[PDB]
Design a protein around this nucleic acid. Sequence first.
DNA 1: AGCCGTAGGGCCCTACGGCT
DNA 2: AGCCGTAGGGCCCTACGGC
Lengths: 671, 670
Amino acid sequence: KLADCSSKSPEECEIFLVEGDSAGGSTKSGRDSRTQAILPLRGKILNVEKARLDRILNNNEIRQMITAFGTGIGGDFDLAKARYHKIVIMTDADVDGAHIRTLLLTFFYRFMRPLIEAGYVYIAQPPTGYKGLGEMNADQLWETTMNPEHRALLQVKLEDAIEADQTFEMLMGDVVENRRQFIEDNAVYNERNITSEMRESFLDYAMSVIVARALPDVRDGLKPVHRRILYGLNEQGMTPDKSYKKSARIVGDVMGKYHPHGDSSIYEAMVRMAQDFSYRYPLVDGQGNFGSMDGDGAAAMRFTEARMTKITLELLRDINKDTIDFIDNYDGNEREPSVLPARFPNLLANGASGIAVGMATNIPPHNLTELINGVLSLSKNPDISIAELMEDIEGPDFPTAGLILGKSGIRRAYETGRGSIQMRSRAVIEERGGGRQRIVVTEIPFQVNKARMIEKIAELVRDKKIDGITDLRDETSLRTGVRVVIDVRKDANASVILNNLYKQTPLQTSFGVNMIALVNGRPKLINLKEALVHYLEHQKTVVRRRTQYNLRKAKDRAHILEGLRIALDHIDEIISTIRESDTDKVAMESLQQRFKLSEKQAQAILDMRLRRLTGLERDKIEAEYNELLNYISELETILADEEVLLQLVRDELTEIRDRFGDDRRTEIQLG
Amino acid sequence: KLADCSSKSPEECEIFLVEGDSAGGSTKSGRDSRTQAILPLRGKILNVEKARLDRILNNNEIRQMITAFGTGIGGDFDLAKARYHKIVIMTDADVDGAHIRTLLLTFFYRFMRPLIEAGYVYIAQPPTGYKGLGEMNADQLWETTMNPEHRALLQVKLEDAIEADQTFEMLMGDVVENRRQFIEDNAVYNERNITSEMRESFLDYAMSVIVARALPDVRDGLKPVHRRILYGLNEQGMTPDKSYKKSARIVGDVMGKYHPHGDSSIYEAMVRMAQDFSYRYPLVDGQGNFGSMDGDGAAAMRFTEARMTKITLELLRDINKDTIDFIDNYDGNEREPSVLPARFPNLLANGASGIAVGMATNIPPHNLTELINGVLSLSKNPDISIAELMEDIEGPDFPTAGLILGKSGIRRAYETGRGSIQMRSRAVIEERGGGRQRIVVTEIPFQVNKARMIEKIAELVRDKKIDGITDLRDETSLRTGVRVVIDVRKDANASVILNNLYKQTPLQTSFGVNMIALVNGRPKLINLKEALVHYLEHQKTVVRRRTQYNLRKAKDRAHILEGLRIALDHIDEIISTIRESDTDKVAMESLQQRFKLSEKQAQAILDMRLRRLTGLERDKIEAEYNELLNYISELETILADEEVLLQLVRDELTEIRDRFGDDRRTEIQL
DNA sequence: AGCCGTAGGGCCCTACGGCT
DNA sequence: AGCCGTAGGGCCCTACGGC
Ligand SMILES: O=c1cc(NCC2CN(C[C@@H]3Cc4ccnc(Cl)c4C3)C2)c2cc(F)ccc2o1
Ligand SMILES: [Cl-]
Ligand SMILES: [Mn+2]
Ligand SMILES: [Mn+2]
Ligand SMILES: [Mn+2]
């Protein structure tokens, strides 16, 4: 744990706080052991502005610091008892390191304010480009960050205690809405004042969580971790027709290439995209144990294999035709997509769920046939209304099936982006023999843990909080599908029992809609229409850019083809012209001038292999050339009449609906 | 946590024992929840043959089977209290599953012997091709293994209790040697009798660990994990000139392609190869917290990055030149090297350390100049004596420097493969002012944890087990290197204190030399000479094959160039021939016919780009031909004569020693 | 309540041989 | 005794918002 220095003269000593043991090892290896101590922490640290005291005092990482500092806390804070006069925060140089810093200041500020007032609290400034202090060699760390001769600490200054109380309460407090407002007002897409630092550090954290972690893009419906996963699967060509591949490779690969975060965030995001109880349309095809509806985790990543689903191909379809803008990855050594072509409205179809900072999102999945007809109808009428859409899109369609009670929250969510929706299991009452009945549950509400739900029921019977239940079993199986059996006592009204379980168990459960997604890179709450409007315009830009791309590429080809026909019509002079040229450059120049060729045409000829002279290519080329001219007119046509552009989108979407659309699962009963 | 079945009638109740919760998931998803209970365990389970009773009674996974079985054990075993009539062992279908099988039986036999007597014990037979049962889809597991209508269970049958007795004790007992005899005796390079299965399961496990895990190869000194790692580094071109790559993806890559084992075994083996205090010549070049001599682990693999060292390039040099035999990986989707060319004696240079089954290895690191001078001397005197070799190779050379006391143990290790080697820290006594002194240690023995040792010293001071010390400081730094200061009480005899310290602490330690390596695929205790003979033999083959390889490719290419030269000699004919051929196939036949070309020459011409017709290109074509002709002769000379070939290896080894040889670090004192 | 899902962070048991 | 290194297997805390 704590790696203390040897000098017991506090005023000369210093303790450094690092995010964990990985960072601690480099920090132990580079320090001057005489005067520098190290306490590795354990990641995110309790937000003592939110927690109550008993929990605070029983928190190990806190206790370690109090112990380590020796000054006591609060009323008993005794600054003279300090064992170091420099406490240095040295978190990783990332937003998460910045968050932790805010977490640490909050504590010092809430429980050790004089420590700040005496200027005992400093902030190391380690350099960027490292995932964590564990990535630095021990000599670079000491020099950049720990050598007093050159390190650049920032002593924490406390200017206006009134301004600081509000900051910690605003930034780190129970009340989300002031958090959210501070972000909205400040989001923009030697010594240090503790107010600016908290504001500046925490805003970078929040913003990063919002636009690059927890919320999905309206266009493709994806978060970066999923976008990176499927992209990585794409880039490695791991498609449905190819065999499965090991999850660990994938994770390490994506982690090295696109997603610089722990394997668990990567592995578990990939796991969910494969669970058919999680994804209305699974994007990942899984080989092996990928968890269960009882809350069983997936097998460890070394055991499992995965690959793209077929529908995933439509997300990536046309990605290499300049339909979307690529960007550089975290270290610059790679390009990654900012968004996928998403040839189907993935956001609504699979829905979404995220806890951000200052906000959350909660978007239910939907039936794909309805959505496309939804997008189809919108394609034909920009002023279409919400209720006219719910003729196509009757509502959410959970991968778990089950039932929905009434259309009242559906409509409010679609009109406002927020609304509440009751999900009911599918339960029938049936006879079990000898004058007794049983309740049989074959479908459960979305995101509900079956075992947990069974547990609670057992809990009520045992607690006599519910009367009339005799036995309780889970007969679920592969051969059966879900089958949960509740045996009722003879001559009891099974229906009153059922109505109790809905009220008293997750047997009935509510989905709270909170459709926030990223719109032009900014979080926005959207109603159903804006969600569809955005996907549509996305599809418009996609098909357009793709058409503009196929067109550049065809004109290039013909120009090369024009050049090659010439070469063929004068090959003997071509050859000798070449034979008598010392350098390519000489030849390049000579070809251009004699035959009015461009460089490409001229290059393409030089690269032409002898085998291309066979007697028949000249028409093969001629043949190819002519179709090319028909293709170009065809393309030029689409880019010159937006209505033509639109109908093609309709066609390709229609094509999608026929292939992948399916029946509704969730029954919507009028409440 | 047992997943019990809803029913409660032992007559029809089966409990499936599986390695863990990953395996337990698929099993639960495909089983019949009505009648099949599942108890996931936690990997290698306690060897009850080697454990102490109280310790056994307090083992968690043991207690769980009992509690689950509900029949007690040993004396108070009450078969009537059985809660299942089938205890089905469903370990993964790997050698480690087989080991775990042997460990379960051992417990059943020794403590629940009636179960077997009653025939209640069964062995599921999951199909091969899977890593564990978590890689299976539930339906596949149910159909092939759990469905009573298609499965092929084996019921366990005791047949001779004296035989079983002797066997269990032989296999699982703490007597290593009877286990070793059994292997060497039986090494090969429905129902089921319990003796047959144990014998067969255990032997299968031991074989695998002997030949494919724990022992290095005499030729390259590598264990399979190291080899596959370095090889993997090579295939991905993670070379010293290129930049570091994240450990995590290397691990994932090595694991997927070559090493189907836990990332911990992969990462830590990689880490060891990069620690300058573990490897005498680090094979890996690592970036970040790769641990310390204090037993600090490395940083997690999401944090670190790695690449080959330069010297690793010499382990891998010319692997493409058909120098070693490739093999199929574990699933036939890849090829991997059987050994590396090892253009330097890696076995002795970095030594090896490995607990196997029935045996272990402990080879110490050595100085490379010496090693290579050893080989060089050997190469001129097949009959050189071990003493003559020690004139090159004075003894091990630990990465940690330090002292070795005497040479009789060395001399014993090198002549027998075995011998004991007393190591000591480098400690001096110096004054600190005021007539006082201190003991300053600047080097510690090999593989000694430094912090532990200091903590050990502080205990004896506390426990008063030693007297005369007033302070004890680890003043180590990157600028200092190692420096541990023991402050001595004024007028004490600091030498006397130093002497007690050596007796009571790892300040002195011994290295037990146990030089066992894989020779022709089999484990062997070798002497130093043997080790070098095989190395040199390895180098001989490697360079011969490279040369034979280099010769075929040159000949191929010269052949091709001969065809381009002809095409150049008659380009106009060439053009006509092609221009009046309707297809490439027609053209190709015409070129062969018209120019007496082989098919391959004919294609090279067809593929020739127009740009090859310019004056510079044709020169390049002619020039490369002329060089090839000379290179070809050079090669043939070497195959014409063994001394020439033999002289080359010396040259290349000498080359290597000049590039990488360094000074001795460990001092051999008399 | 505590859970939902992307995030920060980390340690334990077992087998096996041989040396102290 | 318990350490040396390749191996089987697995789990906890924290932040974040909404209900
Ligand atoms: O970044 C990573 C991390 C990987 N890590 C292996 C997993 C981390 N290990 C699980 C926990 C660790 C730990 C600590 C303390 N206590 C407990 Cl219980 C545990 C269990 C296995 C990884 C593996 C790959 F194949 C490829 C890329 C990888 O990239
Ligand atoms: Cl070419
Ligand atoms: Mn970090
Ligand atoms: Mn309910
Ligand atoms: Mn296993």
